[PDB]
């Protein structure tokens with residue numbers, strides 16, 4: 001078995017009802033809520049309605065195809081856990097106009113009180129977008145990572161779905177000053193974004209645990225659509241290029 005699959009199994013990822021299985025080759029995911037592995041690649045896939053399909057191969061090539069409608073979908077491939085030193089590489093090939101093409105993940109500290117919205121955090125490092133989340137959050141700071149300027153925001157989700165079920169939680173955002181181009185390799189140096197959030201006191205709770213009720217504290221390269229007004233597709237390839 002691929003090593004991340006073996007590691008996830010040996011740490012009890014099957015405890016989650018929504019975790020499907022290891023698929024050795026490539027699979028199409030269309031259900032409302034699923035996680036799993038295709039090859040060594042973890043995936044998440046979640047929507048509150050509508051129709052959206054994640055096609056993922058064992059080399060990390062993927063496509064999300066969505067149908068127009070009033071719903072929210074987010075999904076994509078990566079890792080069953082966040083690592084603050086990971087360097088995510090990707091190339092995005094096609095984008096009909098997703099709401100976000102974004103690094104996407106969660107942290108969760110079961111020992112923190114749920115009255116503190118920092119006990120559970122959904123985080124985003126946008127790369128392409130047709131919805132601007134700045135309007136929903138407070139500004140943190142601007143910084144440079146891999147030669148480009150990102151700006152941070154913190155928003156709150158009040159009684160909303162999460163990896164721990166309905167919860168009030170913070171979202172941390174990092175948005176670059178320009179859309180990232182298709183057809184070229186890009187890097188997300190995750191440590192720079194973790195650092196930038198921490199620089200304004202926005203601490204990520206633990207990103208390497210299966211303590212939440214519904215899903216791991218995963219980290220993926222995701223396509224998200226909010227109320228898409230047309231059918232669309234978005235496709236790319238993700239990998240780990242962390243210096244090791």
Ligand SMILES: O[C@@H]1[C@@H](O)[C@H](O[C@@H]2CO[C@@H](O)[C@H](O)[C@H]2O)OC[C@H]1O
Nearest residue numbers: 044046074157160161162163214215
């Ligand atoms: O893994 C799933 C999460 O992806 C989901 O989180 C919602 C996804 O859309 C985002 O815009 C929302 O802020 C967030 O509530 O929660 C359920 C979980 O199983």
